[PDB]
Amino acid sequence: HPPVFQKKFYIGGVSEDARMFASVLRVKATDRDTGNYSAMAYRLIIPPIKEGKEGFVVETYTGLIKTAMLFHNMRRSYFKFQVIATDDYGKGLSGKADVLVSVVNQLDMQVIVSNVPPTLVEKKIEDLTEILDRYVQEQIPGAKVVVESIGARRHGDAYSLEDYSKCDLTVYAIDPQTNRAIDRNELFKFLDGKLLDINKDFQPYYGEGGRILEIRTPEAVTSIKKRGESLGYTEGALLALAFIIILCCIPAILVVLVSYRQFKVR
Amino acid sequence: HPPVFQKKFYIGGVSEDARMFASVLRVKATDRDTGNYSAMAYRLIIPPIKEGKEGFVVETYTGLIKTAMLFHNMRRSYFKFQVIATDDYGKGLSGKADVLVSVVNQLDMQVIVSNVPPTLVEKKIEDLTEILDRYVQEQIPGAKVVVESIGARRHGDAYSLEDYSKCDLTVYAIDPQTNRAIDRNELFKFLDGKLLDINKDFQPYYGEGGRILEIRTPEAVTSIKKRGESLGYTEGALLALAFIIILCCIPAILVVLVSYRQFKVR
Amino acid sequence: HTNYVRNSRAVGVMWGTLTICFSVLVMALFIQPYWIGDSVQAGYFGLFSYCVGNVLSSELICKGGPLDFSSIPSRAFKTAMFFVALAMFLIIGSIICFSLFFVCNTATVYKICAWMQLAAATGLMIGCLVYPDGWGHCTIRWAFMLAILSIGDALILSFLAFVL
Amino acid sequence: HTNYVRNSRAVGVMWGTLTICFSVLVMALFIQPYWIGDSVQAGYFGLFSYCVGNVLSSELICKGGPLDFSSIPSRAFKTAMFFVALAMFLIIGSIICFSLFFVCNTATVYKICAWMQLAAATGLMIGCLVYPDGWGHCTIRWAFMLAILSIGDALILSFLAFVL
């Protein structure tokens, strides 16, 4: 007998400098009645990719989707494929579903900062993403917050300190219609407009004296100005040489004009 | 009743630019007879770290060790701590064990290259590391191959291509005595001396027509020469200006010497 | 007209000095790494070789150097390279017309080097006009501005050379 | 002695030109980014500010610039900075002794600028000797080699200034 999916279209998304076989998500095609879904073999049906890439993989008895490709300078290479789940340890019947996965850069990142330790954040990240994608999908049904990395709060000397009482949370939702990565400013504005409604909700999750603080910009956005180089001073020295020598030659022209003029006079 | 560990000292190790909450390893303190070890709560006892770091974490009902700290320029900050496992969903008795974890750079990496697709490698990585740490611990009991990243084979234009028939495998073993990271050349030589003995062994694992090919050096070692800048040509232009002007002033000295000498003569 | 012949031989050896100064200036204009760049791709290309990359990428590869007469994309870049290389060899020949100063007349050699600096200013003007036709954001580097100051430089050198 | 006075006024305006050339040379020696570096830490420090980092690290921070008389570590670096800054202001004063050329005697102003270039060569010699005492691998950059060529440069300028 075939399994029963939770969502008929599971929804994924990864990043550019993500490593090989990173955690995309875990799937669950449930058994219908008996709950004997440990005999399920989650497998794939994958459309062909250039150069023979397998690209997106999954395990068998965990359902955890992993990656089989690198992303040197690739961007928004959105991939749709099929996933199956075979009953009877890979012998019974099956149902199939599809997954979209996007590949995001540093510029498709906005940090959520709250006033809690980050290990509690990564502990309760399931319910955190659950409450987010509960109160965000009223924008668009088809949005799914994809957590990138959960660090301590970057601040200080060129954003190189860590606050442990606070946290960094790197997220992005899903484009279900044009099916690609999402720029950081709509990532700001779709979240920031309903901030207090979810500040209500994290009291069984943050605890007490806890709330969402701010929605700020990552660190490598600042480095974009830094890698752009400019006019130095050695260059300016050579330009100053040219300006010096034309500044020398002009009075030479005028004095030799007066010279040949007085040569004509006397 | 307390659990039963597999090894009384579990052994870990991470890298420098590893991300937050990365897969260190999974622990297993087994139930002794009944096999009812789903009521085990794997928890920690951690010595204090500077600035209030929690640093190394673990989950509860999976045993998977994760990270709670970043590594801007840190190196060989080896950490020993305690781990517990409480019976009865966190109410029974416990046994305790310890874990050493090192933090390695790009320079503590050597790539294993074989002639197999990388997804089969990451599939059978358990048995791969098992056969490695079977036939390597005859060097030192206390060595544990720590796989960093499994990519396709870097070659081509400045090592920027991928071979899918072949594979990259970034490993390192463990220092159990001086308890720190291991440089790449002993990582080469401890493996390369018994290559054919393990080329025998991967025939149920690679399949047929498969063996270990070579033990080569990662890509970022080459970039170390590239970041070292040198004398340009604008610099050389200014030096040439100085050399020109001394080359002009020396015959001026000699001609004005002859000038004042002939002034003395006539 | 004693002070006027003082001025004559003075500005003659000034031709020598300032000419070899702009010889190494134009040679520096050749063997630089920076011609025209951009900061929004993200590249610091240079029309003989070109390092082109993307955002925050560390490793860059410039494609060229000692030419094969086919390495750079635009033939307009090849032709302007030939103009400015003729300007290079011209100013080396102007060092040679300084070397041929003591044999012939001053009014001879001044007209020789005058014809030289005329052709130098003309060829540099043409190459500087050719580059934007070979060509989309840009950040222009110091090469073209050094060249456009060298325009008026060789213009003033040729004007005072016609004066002498 | 007509050709000899030709030589006299010729090399006088040569003092003007080559002096202002080394004025902008020493000003370039000041406002560079590279003093002494190293490639095995991994840093490109510069004794007024210092960008120090490690292997393959992208972001660097130079610590200094317009000084506070306390920013740089070594007082020997501060004192050698004061020597070479006196050399800077000296060569600016040598542009001023070129500006005071038309009032007094030639033999007066040549001895003035001779005393100048004497003190310039002496102070640059002292600062170049001081830097290795302030100081472990190194890769020396082009600053010290430009300075050590400027040593013999100002030496030759002062020698021919004593000649004139």
Numbering used by the authors:
A (entry chain C), B (entry chain A): 1145 to 1410
C (entry chain D), D (entry chain B): 15 to 54, 58 to 152, 171 to 199
Passage from the reporting paper:
The resulting structure harbors an overall 2-fold symmetry, containing two copies of PCDH15 and LHFPL5. Each PCDH15 protomer makes more extensive interactions with one LHFPL5 protomer (1100 Å2 buried surface area, BSA) compared to the other (LHFPL5’, 270 Å2 BSA). While there is a small interface of interactions between the 2-fold related PCDH15 TM helices (126 Å2 BSA), it likely is only a minor contributor to the stability of the complex. While the crosslinking of the other residues is consistent with their close proximity in our model, the lack of a clearly defined periodicity indicates that the tip of the helices and the linker region are somewhat flexible.
Hair cells have a characteristic morphology and harbor actin-filled stereocilia ‘staircases’ in which the stereocilia are coupled by protocadherin 15 (PCDH15) molecules from one stereocilium linked with cadherin 23 (CDH23) molecules from an adjacent stereocilium. Upon movement of the stereocilia induced by fluctuations of the surrounding fluid, the PCDH15-CDH23 ‘tip links’ trigger the opening of a mechano-electrical transduction (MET) ion channel at the stereocilia tips. Here we demonstrate that PCDH15 forms a robust complex with LHFPL5 and that the assembly is composed of 2 copies of each protein, thus providing concrete evidence that the composition of PCDH15 in the tip link is a dimer.
